[PDB]
Design an enzyme around this catalytic site. Sequence first.
Site, PDB file in Angstrom:
ATOM      1  CG  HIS A 180      -0.232  -0.181   2.169  1.00 39.91           C
ATOM      2  ND1 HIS A 180      -0.548   0.675   2.966  1.00 39.91           N
ATOM      3  CD2 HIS A 180      -0.624  -0.819   3.321  1.00 39.91           C
ATOM      4  CE1 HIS A 180      -0.063   1.118   4.479  1.00 39.91           C
ATOM      5  NE2 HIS A 180       0.002  -0.557   4.576  1.00 39.91           N
ATOM      6  CG  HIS A 215       3.919   6.079   5.690  1.00 39.78           C
ATOM      7  ND1 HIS A 215       4.712   5.474   6.658  1.00 39.78           N
ATOM      8  CD2 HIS A 215       2.643   6.360   5.267  1.00 39.78           C
ATOM      9  CE1 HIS A 215       2.858   5.805   7.016  1.00 39.78           C
ATOM     10  NE2 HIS A 215       1.658   6.391   6.522  1.00 39.78           N
ATOM     11  CG  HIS A 218      -0.733   8.460   2.512  1.00 38.60           C
ATOM     12  ND1 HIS A 218      -1.425   7.029   2.789  1.00 38.60           N
ATOM     13  CD2 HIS A 218       0.171   8.999   3.500  1.00 38.60           C
ATOM     14  CE1 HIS A 218      -1.338   6.779   4.210  1.00 38.60           C
ATOM     15  NE2 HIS A 218      -0.286   7.479   4.233  1.00 38.60           N
ATOM     16  CD  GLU A 237      -3.504   9.662   3.645  1.00 40.34           C
ATOM     17  OE1 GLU A 237      -3.333   9.712   4.949  1.00 40.34           O
ATOM     18  OE2 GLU A 237      -4.212   8.589   2.998  1.00 40.34           O
ATOM     19  CB  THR A 277      -4.562   8.310   6.500  1.00 36.69           C
ATOM     20  OG1 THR A 277      -3.436   7.419   6.650  1.00 36.69           O
ATOM     21  CG2 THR A 277      -4.303   8.978   7.629  1.00 36.69           C
ATOM     22  CB  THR A 278      -3.625   2.259   6.307  1.00 36.22           C
ATOM     23  OG1 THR A 278      -2.976   2.094   7.169  1.00 36.22           O
ATOM     24  CG2 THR A 278      -3.328   3.072   4.851  1.00 36.22           C
TER      25      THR A 278
HETATM   26 ZN   LIG Z   1       0.108   7.437   6.392  1.00 33.35          ZN
END
Ligand SMILES: [Zn+2]
Length: 259
Positions: free
Chosen positions: A63, A93, A95, A105, A197-198
């Site tokens: 992801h 990480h 996004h 996000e 958020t995941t």
């Molecule tokens: Zn994140």
Amino acid sequence: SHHWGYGKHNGPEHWHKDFPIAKGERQSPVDIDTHTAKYDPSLKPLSVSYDQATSLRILNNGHAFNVEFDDSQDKAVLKGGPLDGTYRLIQFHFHWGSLDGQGSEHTVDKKKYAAELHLVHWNTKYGDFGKAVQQPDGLAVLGIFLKVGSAKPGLQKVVDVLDSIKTKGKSADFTNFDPRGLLPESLDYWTYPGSLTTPPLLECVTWIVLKEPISVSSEQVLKFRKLNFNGEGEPEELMVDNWRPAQPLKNRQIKASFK
Ligand SMILES: [Zn+2]
Ligand SMILES: [Cu+2]
């Protein structure tokens, strides 16, 4: 759980079936309405102490990709600001989008940035990450927006290893990386209580979102977009648009560290 993602059939609008907290009272990300955020003169200065950060490895988890750190000692910690106590860096990480006009996000007055960096930390009072994510103050995530412009020199070592972790499940050695080269000049921030958020979307996070974005080059973000969601030997699905949209603010206030 398995088989959630960012596609039409398993993306954010579907997550609540396996993770009902997706419709909870403190979900992330959110839109930051800058005019409605209130300056809090009681917040203390944010302290980011990464001098002894010890990176270990980079992993494609299907992801995003995670740069992992040795969190067995207080080597890289976040303190101050809204936080009580000491929070230890475990991973960072990103996004990002399929296009430069989307990928973050959090949004700022509905503006979407090209990407967003998350530096993930756990509250040392709880002993380890797994216990921390059973606590409402277990985690602190420092969020930093990316805009496309000039190259970020401190990102280049990350970009240069992505070819070796193209597919899900691949990892590479990633020692001696200094995450200080990913920070903007200013540590002015917004803060609110939220969630991962995941999936599993756990409501454990004090979010600290920096106001000043960092600039990365077009070429740098293009290399993020060559990663794959899939495993080796499976049909190729480019790792793009791995962001959750803004969620309802509900009974929350966003605080600003600046005026
Ligand atoms: Zn994140
Ligand atoms: Cu599952």
